[PDB]
Amino acid sequence: YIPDYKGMEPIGANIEDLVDYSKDWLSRARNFSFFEVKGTAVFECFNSNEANHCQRYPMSRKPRNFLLIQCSLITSYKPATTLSDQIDSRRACSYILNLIPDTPASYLIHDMAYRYINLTREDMINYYAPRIQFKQTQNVREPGTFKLTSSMLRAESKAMLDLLNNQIESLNIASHIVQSESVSLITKILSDLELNITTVLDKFFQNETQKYLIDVLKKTTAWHIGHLIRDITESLIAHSGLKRSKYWSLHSYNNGNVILFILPSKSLEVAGSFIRFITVFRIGPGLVDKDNLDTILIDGDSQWGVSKVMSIDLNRLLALNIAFEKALIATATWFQYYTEDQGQFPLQYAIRSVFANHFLLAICQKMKLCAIFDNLRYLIPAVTSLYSGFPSLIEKLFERPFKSSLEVYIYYNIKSLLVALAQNNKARFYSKVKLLGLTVDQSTVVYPSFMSRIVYKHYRSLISEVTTCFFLFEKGLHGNMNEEAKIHLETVEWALKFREKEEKYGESLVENGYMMWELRANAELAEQQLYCQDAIELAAIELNKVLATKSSVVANSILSKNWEEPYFSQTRNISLKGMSGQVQEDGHLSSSVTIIEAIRYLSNSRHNPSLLKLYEETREQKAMARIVRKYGFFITTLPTRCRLEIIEDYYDAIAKNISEEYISYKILAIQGALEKALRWASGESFIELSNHKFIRMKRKLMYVSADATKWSPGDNSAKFRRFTSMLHNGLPNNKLKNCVIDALKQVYKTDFFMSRKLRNYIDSMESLDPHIKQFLDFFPDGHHGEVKGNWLQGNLNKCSSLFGVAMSLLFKQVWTNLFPELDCFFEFAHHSDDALFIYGYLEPVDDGTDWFLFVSQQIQAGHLHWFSVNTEMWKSMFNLHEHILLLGSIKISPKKTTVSPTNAEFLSTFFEGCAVSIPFVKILLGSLSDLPGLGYFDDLAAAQSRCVKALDLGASPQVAQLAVALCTSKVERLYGTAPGMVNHPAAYLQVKHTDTPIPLGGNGAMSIMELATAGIGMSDKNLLKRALLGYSHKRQKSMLYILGLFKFLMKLSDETFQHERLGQFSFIGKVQWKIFTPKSEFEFADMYTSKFLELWSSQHVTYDYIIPKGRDNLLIYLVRKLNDPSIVTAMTMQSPLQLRFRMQAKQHMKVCRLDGEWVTFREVLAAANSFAENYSATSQDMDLFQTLTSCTFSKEYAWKDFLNGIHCDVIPTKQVQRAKVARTFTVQIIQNSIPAVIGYKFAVTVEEMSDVLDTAKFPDSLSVDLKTMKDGVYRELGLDISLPDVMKRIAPMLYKSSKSRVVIVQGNVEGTAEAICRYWLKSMSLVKTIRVKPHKEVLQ
Description:
Name: RNA-directed RNA polymerase L
Radius of gyration: 34 Å
PDB class: viral protein
Assembly: monomeric
Largest sheet: 6 strands, antiparallel
Entry title: Apo Hantaan virus polymerase in monomeric state
Helix content: 40-55%
Keywords: Bunyavirus, Hantaan virus, polymerase, dimer, viral protein
């Protein structure tokens, strides 16, 4: 049922009125919004912005410190050990005690060295003892620390400690001297870093990546400095515990040449805490900035740099810990991009320079560099086009102050590069190429590298280089304290502008729109946040001209949106996305989760309402918005999400029916527009004269790339109302359309709330600036203020895209009506937030006298709008298009919008951006970023899955293999399972490290190909199959021992309760690891006990395959989902408390579950060996093992078989780069889904039966389907489905789910998973051509 909502009565909007308005508008001069790229213009823009930056900022004469850790290396670095730490610390203290301190930091260092070197033998024994054998001493109260009180502290040291415990200038970027000094310093550091200290995939890796990348960088100073930095950051992390951070610590490295002093500090477990440390090193080549050192002590022919006190937080510490891996993966990505651009491997000097640059960027994590590279990502396209908004981007380069030498150096390089690129465009000339399927005239002009003296053939290599640089910075830098405040002020500024417009014109005009006659009378109404009602209606008519031919499809799509389906039974409504909660007693808006709000509603309700019913029950509630705590993003409340879902469902249903013409979802619309444009340009124009003669006019094209659909804080949602009122749908009534209009009306006004963090920051300002004064004045009660028009980045993308398409069609009709005699062209295409506009204009073939005479005569004959057509007609085309878009509330961005002629590189970049949305380097670096902390097996699986996802995003298999190796090495380091460390399974399990199951610390190192095809768990499956075969054939003892290990893991799993689900069924046992959740701090996690939840899960088995629809079962199901360890870990990902477990993992504490106790991983291994030694196989165990080996894991072994049965050979042909395209990695009797059939099988209750009936598409066939499949299991494999255990084992074998992976490939590849695998095998070499031998389908 749909309640009767009020509709909108149509207005008498006339297209000819808009045509007359455009006639008047085009009769005068208009300003083009973009600037010509000239080289001199870019240089002058840089100089003027330098002068302005000098004006706005107070001057600093001393560049700030940018190196968090200062050190030097002259010899190959050996990783630190406890014995090496002791020896190096003794030698280092002996070295330091001979020196004469000058500065207070030097005095503190001397005092610390004296205290450490005078600790007793028991103190030294307990200083390096593990937590198990540690015994507290008077001086040593924590394992790796000691005590240093004021009795032995000097006066200078004590004063310095007291000072430690208890306006924004900028460098003079306009000075050539400041640039010269910064360039000199950074050049010296980079040269120091570059110095040298003194399977088929396996073969390709050893010949290419090992030879040209790994062997080159293995000897560089950067490699060993990175390992030394990893050791230092490990010490700093180990000191960050609650008990240990209050004491002092001393560590040493490189035979005493590097010394770390750790001072008492607040623990990193609690948020907003810093570790303080001082690094003392021998002066030499490395990460040395002598001008920023605290002091330089002199010894006989030697120097010791003592740094100032460094305070580092948890995120910066983790980034510095993984800096070496980040730099190596960035350099490997650069390696692959270089081989793609040039077709050859880079030389040693270029790889060394790239690696040094990447390492310097990765160790120096600051927001200024990240913002600079973010801006460069769009600055590079802005100087390679004909027209762009590069002055605005160069201005954006100067928003924050310049503080360090590194910032000045990067800016100087960027200015040089951009001026060089802009000066390249002056050699533009017309030529001939083969675009799409035509020979067309293109206007082309050597792109220098940014870190080496390499020149690319394409500027997309430059763009990807800058992108990889930008992703070297942690995503935790965004947000911080400047971005949150900035987004708050931007929102409040746009709301204040909306209020000013309301005061000037009245609330009705800003909400309902202005009329065309008012626009003619005032001419200032054409702006952002205001729209013309006539323009909205006419754009709706223009879109209706396309929609009226597909009315049936649009209607069927809308009714296919399932408006009567229960709201909270859908996945998107029970997710962990993030949602605003309730207004608390103190008056703030709560940051909450979608599932938590779902449980809050159901617990206070008696039914699971549908979307329309939920909208009617919450209609009267006000929309509320907030900034997300830490994850510039907004979160809204449940009624706001419901209204946005109504609007977006309606408009997605409508917009999917024009996806092949205007809105690319794939690239068909853009290719069609390009084909039409190129076909049009092939012809010639003949303008008819009054004297029956003709003028010959030549056709040319201009392309504009713009982000027109992207959400803007300056916008008015109310326009959509009239749009919705006039858009044609096939429905016979207006109830659904009226409901959409009503939802739009209810989303108009929002309560935007300040955050607690920002409020505290404001209260700590101590000096309220005028903009801060206005921002605080925006909130009457100090908590929330009303916002209108702006929908706060809510999901309305399909509506905005459809609206933009309608306005572009309106412009197309208006321009056709303006020049009936002229034969002009216009074609546009939308893809996500991007849009490509193609204008086809006319130029005189001759000198142009006849054309000028014709234009003058047309002007004299009263057609005054021909003034805009005399020269540069495409400019007037774009001006009128932009003005018409502004008649809605669409402003084409002055920045980030590029204008080009026909150009192969421009179109290639646009199509590449359309095909791929995420660079694979982002996923590659996020693999090292952080781990879920759920144990060895889970962390390994997560890292491997991220590497496979990166491979799906276009990463070469060699780069992905290197990333897999690095991630596996890091996980083994964290859990101690690698050889030589205390958690190595080979010391307890009496089997080989490769014969050990992964949950028991086994060797998880696997090929990237098998991980991508077979999956992220096939090591255990292969081990089980081999052990079963060996025992069943030869009855060997070792195979029985491996089976016993698997049975021990299975018993471990049975000890715990993991109901799981069809999509996450597990059969190989897993060690249960300690997860220090906030003890279920979640609000509604305490509704039902774990025992009650386990009983419910056992009783209701059908709900393990489908989702309940009734309120009670849904509430219990959602509580159970809340109580999932994996969901708990994800819901506390950004909590600063997690590191405790990491430390407990590194200290090898009692973090594993065994016999209802918390024990060490070593104790788990000992129990595993004890169980496996006495284990004897039974009939039930052998039967089960056969079901898993031959049936459950059957699909994965098949991909392995195909992998092992393939043959590839090198063809004497150079590799050819191709356009990248997305494909689907997807690998009949039963007409219902397997989850529905199985739930029907297990349905015993009326509620469960009804739930499966609603879930199933064809309920009537359900039983029949079950029957036939119940035959197959008892016919193809001879197993009894009637047993629930057998059903659970066989269900994931019969479930052909997932495969919804999207893989980026080249053009030739097909959509078959076998084709994707064959393409991956052909891309196993970065230079050579690989041909597969079978040349047929060899996958079962």
